[model samples]
Target: LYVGSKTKEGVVHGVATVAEKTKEQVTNVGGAVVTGVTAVAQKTVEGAGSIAAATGFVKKD
Candidate 1:
């Protein structure tokens, strides 16, 4: 029974490790997506600002 429990423990530990690795990968992907979205938003805002200035809708200092 003791040997059986040890084997079970090893399996549980391996599964836990796999789960942690999966979570880490998901977190990394989510962070990368967020960063890309933020960069795009910043670029869009800058482009809109330029257009507004050129059209005289916004005064350029």
Candidate 2:
């Protein structure tokens, strides 16, 4: 009976560990996508500023 209980506990613990690993991977992927999106937004803002300067809509310092 004791051996059976230990085996069951070990199996449950392993499953929990695998689930945690999967969660971490998902979180990392989400973070990477967010970073990429932020970079694209920054580039778009920079492009707009350049266009404004070229068109004399913005005064040069």
Candidate 3:
């Protein structure tokens, strides 16, 4: 019983660690996308408007 409990605990801990990695990557990607679009706002106002439209769609959902 002790061995089984230890094995289950190890697996749960590994899954939590992996999930934490994915959380960091997703947040990093989101930040990159927002900053990249904002940084390019000098070239085209319309581009920013289109991005806002897409963003609004997500917000509506």
Candidate 4:
């Protein structure tokens, strides 16, 4: 899990994923539905030639 406190410096960003199974099971139960998505990539200066420049501010307040 990803979490943060107030004392941290700068900003942080990450990914969160959720999924579900739609396949049929041996029992009489039906399929399932849940959230499954990809977090958008962090914004940055394209072709900066430096990984340090590719980032954005993400704060959990």
Which one is best on lDDT?
4
Q: Which portions of model 4 show Cα errors greater than 4 Å?
A: 1-12, 23-37, 42-61
Candidate 3 stretches with Cα past 4 Å from truth are 1-24, 27-61
Q: Write the per-residue lDDT of candidate 3 for residues 19-47, one digit (tens) a residue.
A: 23333333443333332233222234345
For candidate 4, write residues 1-61 as lDDT tens digits.
Answer: 4565554433456756556779844533344333333443343455433332323344679
**Local distance difference test values of all predictions, in order:** 0.27, 0.27, 0.31, 0.44
Which runs in model 1 stand beyond 4 Å of their true positions? 1-23, 27-36, 42-61
Residue 13, model 3: lDDT of 22
**Residue pairs with clashing backbones, model 1:** none
Top TM-score model: 4
- For residues 1-61, write the lDDT of model 2, one tens digit per residue: 3555533221212222222333333344222222111111123423442311213144568
Off by over 4 Å in 2: 1-23, 27-36, 42-61
Tens digits of per-residue lDDT for model 1, 1-61:
3555522211212222222343333344222222111111123423442311213144568
Worst 10 residues of 3 by lDDT: 9-18
* Candidate 2 local distance difference test against the native: 0.27
